[PDB]
């Protein structure tokens, strides 16, 4: 019970550093054994804090890339529900952002692996957004084939800062959704 | 921070000169694109074309297609359009963008609901806007990928446009990686002829690599230098993995910055006066810090009495001695590069290239371990002692036409050793001469001027950047090292031990029960295994009833 906290503390010292990385156009990444919830939600209570922090849990089946762009655009962005074609959506949100500058939006995705995010369109979106400098991306990954689905164009659109981030915590709220057959 | 002012300085100086040298390496090839295009315009139903070979780099060259839009709008010659292949599944979007783009090529320089475009108005723009020019414009239809062109689509356009032609002497540029056989594959023979191609060449990543290293990182301009391990790991990510000078650059910022967050000790990393200003600004904490690191501690170890404390206690005799450490330091590095290029025209000419070929290589191997201590160097010795004669006098006279060209142009020094060498080789032009020049290249240069990173002056840290590992974590993206070694090396640890152990396929009757022969106790293996699904070290597999089986090896 004792050890984990210290590690979840050590990563916090990189935090401000990540902020600077977030300014420089890159996006940090955590490959853990465990869950970063207490660390990613401490990143919400410690670093992000502030405002304009969008949270979509990928182990949540509920949120969807269309309702990801709504969930970003509906409440927090507050502009609208994103229009039918997502390319047009991002063209409106962007002509708002390209016009309205210096608005930094920090998004934290638990388990990009998804679905819904499996779609090459979904990561052409996240590719454009996280490529769009205003917002910024912190993703937590599990699937061994996570690096599989990221191609050249996307690992370019995602400039990924990959971090040790070896995490021992469950995987409790991540584990609450998965069902197995002994029950 | 000061290091970030230095960042943007260096940084945009770097991409600046990168994009300019991109524009020159162009300029021979682009002056040969408009000189080819103006050779075919100098001199029916056949589309002539231009085939450019750009090896396997995508985004770096979109600049120069923006600059073909520009440059080939500039000659007053064509109005240029670019058709992308992925834009382009059907036969409609190419003629639509054909013409959208040559009515548009008439617009941007003057400083609807785009569904409205079709196959007519190009045939009108070089008719209606100008039918009588009289000298027809090329529209070089830059087909930025013709490889991904839909083949049905491909022949339907080369046949539709070919059929229509000489009202439109279209030429079309080919963004391409490979050699002519593959065009001859995706473009059929009827097309290989309709294209009337003249094959052209465009420079790839690896050349821009060796060039840029020789130039940029190994410039004496910027003090920053790299340790063997992030040079090896970087040029390994470039050579062994991803060929983009993009990823090597962004990785070079991330190195630049990464160091430049190490400790303030680099604020002295600047030109001797720019650094000495910072010397004046130095405070007692930093005085503690210089008192600490090795090559200072080493520089402190071959020391003396009080003197040593006015390093350790009373800062003034240090900061004086910092201007002693550092002045020297930025003297040494110049004394190297002057001499490194030197080595190259000697041994870059040589065969076997056992120590190295490209300038980056000599930098690498020279700095890795003692050149003298390595035997491949001695092998190169035996070589030079063999060749002798006129091959050497020509190549060496080219080492002074060209290295005296460096100290005449490329480098100011003026080190007074250079000059002595120089006179020596003039005298030769007019064996143990080659072996006293090489021994001069040995004792006077390799022994003395080429020397190592760790055998160097005090404070070789912070100008030379250690701490490779973390970047490799933050770039190389090696999750399965940390994973494999973590899950191997504890109920999930033992779980992965079982997932290693059992056989191949493990039946959940006697897997739940073999894990009950081998091993509250169950739920952690179903979460280990459901993660190993989510992780992916197994899969929830149907090859047998109630089974979990790995795709990963």
Residue numbers in the entry:
A (entry chain G): 284 to 466
B (entry chain A): 41 to 83, 97 to 164, 188 to 506, 548 to 606, 628 to 657, 676 to 709
From the manuscript:
The structure of HsORC reveals a remarkable similarity between two very different ATPases: the replication initiator ORC-CDC6 ATPase and the replication fork DNA polymerase clamp loader.
The resulting electron-density map was clear enough to show a significant movement of helices in ORC3 compared to the DmORC structure. In addition, the position of the WHD of ORC2 would result in significant clashes for two of the four ORC2 copies present in the crystal. This indicated to us that the structures were suitable for docking into the HsORC cryoEM reconstruction.
